[PDB]
Ligand binder design. Structure first.
Ligand SMILES: OC1(CNc2ncnc3[nH]ccc23)CCSCC1
Ligand SMILES: [Cl-]
Length: 167
């Protein structure tokens, strides 16, 4: 039993809600919140910009030190950093950005990072400004993640379409 509330159950381990991931994180304070990161951990917009703003830019400061030490992530890769005021940890995961020409096949590799964590609050990878089809992202999530994932979908119209079309 956990403290996530109001989710629709899609499968044994995947749940979905119409919610702002920032507000969800502030309420639940989960062990792991997933960021929709880019390889440079430049949290300018989308989910990343919103999560960073909620940390008063502390996420960006920590991320800049991480990159200065380690260099960029790989597309499909991840790193674990602090969750600041939002969660214990933030798992920064880089899905392919279709608006950059990146291979959508890397979406499965990105979701594999979730399997290293028993429970996560997450957005749909490569959705929104990363330009992939969110219906496709949900399918890859369900077919790849085996740990317990609570998906927050900001857009109510999109949430309803994802539910209604789910196979
Ligand atoms: O959910 C997405 C990604 N974007 C966000 N998701 C959750 N919380 C968020 N807060 C700010 C942005 C944001 C992908 C699925 S379709 C609707 C958009
Ligand atoms: Cl977005």
């Amino acid at each position: 039993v956990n403290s996530f509330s109001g989710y629709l159950k899609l499968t044994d381990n995947v749940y979905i809600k119409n919610a702002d991931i920032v507000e969800e994180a502030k309420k639940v304070k989960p062990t792991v919140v997933v960021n929709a990161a880019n390889v440079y951990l430049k949290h300018g917009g989308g989910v990343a910009g919103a999560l960073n703003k909620a940390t008063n830019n502390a996420m960006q400061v920590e991320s800049d030190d991480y990159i200065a030490t380690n260099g960029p992530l790989k597309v499909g890769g991840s790193c674990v950093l602090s969750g600041h005021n939002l969660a214990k940890h933030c798992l920064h995961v880089v899905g392919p950005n279709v608006n950059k020409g990146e291979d959508i096949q890397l979406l499965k590799s990105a979701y594999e990072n979730f399997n290293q964590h028993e429970v996560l609050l997450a957005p749909l990878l490569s959705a929104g400004i990363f330009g992939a089809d969110p219906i496709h992202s949900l399918r890859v999530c369900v077919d790849t993640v085996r740990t317990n994932v609570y998906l927050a979908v900001f857009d109510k119209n999109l949430y309803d379409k994802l539910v209604s079309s789910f196979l």
